Amino acid sequence: FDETEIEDFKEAFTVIDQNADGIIDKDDLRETFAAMGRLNVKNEELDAMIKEASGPINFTVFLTMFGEKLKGADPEDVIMGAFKVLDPDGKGSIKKSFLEELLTTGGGRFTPEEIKNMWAAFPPDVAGNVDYKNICYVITHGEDA
């Protein structure tokens, strides 16, 4: 965890903790979702978020919960560092079959089935290994941009 990433989680903690007392309760979760447009947010969704913690969601409990789910989270500059080492001549997005062979043949984390799941929402270019960069974006901030 770099310090600017921890400051981003402190700003997200303050936007969900609308009572500003330092502990995100279930009313803060529901009023942050209603301010984003969720008028139908069920109480069972709020209870499942609180069921991931053993205590009240203060800043260090929110940081330890996000730490334990993001144990391989990598910032965009280090993902582009590794992709610039895979394309060491610069500019070009690397081939689809080169990333499939190098993921498998180096590591067990690069096994195929997982490579079909990589191509599956990370579209073609991304999946193929040709573009580059959009995948670093969606690994640090999810969903389609």
Binding site: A12, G72, A73, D74, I79, G81, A82, V85, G106, H141
Partner: protein
């Protein structure tokens, strides 16, 4: 340029303006001996290369060691997270920030 390769007697031939000149069956014999002599010379020079070739692969494999992991773990996160309320929230919200 072609004759560059082969474990052949680089003697036995000779070039000129319209064509190459080549021995048989003596000069033919010569070359042959020669041919064997390069496998030696060659075969040995190949090896080191081969050897050496992979020796650089290890230096790369090794470097790579972690950059992968980084990549490895890093992805996994996301696959887990991207479905998490809190994380989607942070997501829609991440922009309003400065």
């Amino acid at each position: 340029k072609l004759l560059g390769g082969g474990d052949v007697d680089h003697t036995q031939y000779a070039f000129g303006h319209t064509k190459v000149f080549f021995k048989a069956g003596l000069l033919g014999l010569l070359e042959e001996m020669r041919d064997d002599k390069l496998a030696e010379i060659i075969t040995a020079t190949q090896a080191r290369c081969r050897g050496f070739l992979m020796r650089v692969e290890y230096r790369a494999m090794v470097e790579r060691r972690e950059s992968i992991f980084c990549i490895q773990y890093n992805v996994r996160s996301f696959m887990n997270v991207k479905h998490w309320p809190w994380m989607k929230l942070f997501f829609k919200i991440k922009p309003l920030l400065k």
